Amino acid sequence: SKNEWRKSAIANTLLYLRLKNIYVSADDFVEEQNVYVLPKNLLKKFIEISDVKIQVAAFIYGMSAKDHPKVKEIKTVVLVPQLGHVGSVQISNIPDIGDLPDTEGLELLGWIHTQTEELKFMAASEVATHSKLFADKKRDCIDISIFSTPGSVSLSAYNLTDEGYQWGEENKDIMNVLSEGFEPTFSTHAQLLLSDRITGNFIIPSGNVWNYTFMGTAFNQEGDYNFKYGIPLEFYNEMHRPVHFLQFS
C-alpha cells in the first residue's frame, strides 16, 4: 500500500528523540570478561536508520584499546543486506571487507540489532540467528540487543552458551510457531559501555540498499555481496521501495 508506506516512513522521523533517554545494562565487574565499548555516534545513526516495528541488524567490528587489551572498542558497523520481520531478521553472511582500506587489524566482535519486546535474555529467534552466524566461525561473538520503544532505547549485551549454540543449530530456518526446548538461560550477560569519547564509521553494500523487507524476490541470503565505506540509508528510503520492470531482450 502506498498510503501505509507513507505513514510508516513518517513514524520513523521521530526515532532521533529516543536518543534523549539511553539506558545501558550494568552488572558487577568480572575481570576475566572483555568490556565492549560502543561509540555514541554509531548508536545515534543506527537508531536513526531503524524502524519502529521491524527489526534491523548489523555486524560489529573492532579491536583492543590502548589502556587495556580486554577493552574492545567497536570501530565499524557493517550494515548487510537483510530481510526484517516483527520479532526476527534474516541476515546475509558474515561480510568480506578485506579489500577495503583500514580493515586490517579489525576483529569480528558480533552483531547489533533492535527489538520491540523487553527481555532479560536472547529470544528464541535471536539464539537461532546468532548460532547460524557464529557457531562454526567464532563462538565468543556477542549480541548487542536494543529495546526500542516510544521515548527511549535500552542496550544489553549477551554471550550464547554451548547449550545455546547446540539448540540453535537444531533450528535452522526461523518461524517462531516453535520454540520447543528454548531456554532463557541459554544466554549470559556480557559487559557493555556507551562512550562519546570514541567515534566509529559504517560499511554499507556496494549498491547502497540494505533493506530487502519489501524486495524479497531480489534478496539473496547466501549472496556474495560487495561492500564500501559510506552513509547508510534509512529503512523507508525510496531506494528500498519495490519497483517492477517489463523486459525485452
Swiss-Prot record:
Q: Write down the superkingdom of origin.
A: Eukaryota
**Compartments reported by the entry:** Nucleus
The chain positions of domain MPN read 35-164
Q: What else is known?
A: Present with 468 molecules/cell in log phase SD medium.
Share what the entry says about its subunit structure, partners included: Component of the U4/U6-U5 tri-snRNP complex composed of the U4, U6 and U5 snRNAs and at least PRP3, PRP4, PRP6, PRP8, PRP18, PRP31, PRP38, SNU13, SNU23, SNU66, SNU114, SPP381, SMB1, SMD1, SMD2, SMD3, SMX2, SMX3, LSM2, LSM3, LSM4, LSM5, LSM6, LSM7, LSM8, BRR2 and DIB1.
Domain text: The MPN (JAB/Mov34) domain has structural similarity with deubiquitinating enzymes, but lacks the residues that would bind the catalytic metal ion.
State the function annotated in the UniProt record: Functions as a scaffold that mediates the ordered assembly of spliceosomal proteins and snRNAs. Required for association of BRR2 with the spliceosomal U5 snRNP, and the subsequent assembly of the U4/U6-U5 tri-snRNP complex. Functions as a scaffold that positions spliceosomal U2, U5 and U6 snRNAs at splice sites on pre-mRNA substrates, so that splicing can occur. Interacts with both the 5' and the 3' splice site, as well as the branch region. Has a role in branch site-3' splice site selection. Associates with the branch site-3' splice 3'-exon region. Also has a role in cell cycle.
UniProt protein name: Pre-mRNA-splicing factor 8
| Originating species | Saccharomyces cerevisiae (strain ATCC 204508 / S288c) (Baker's yeast)
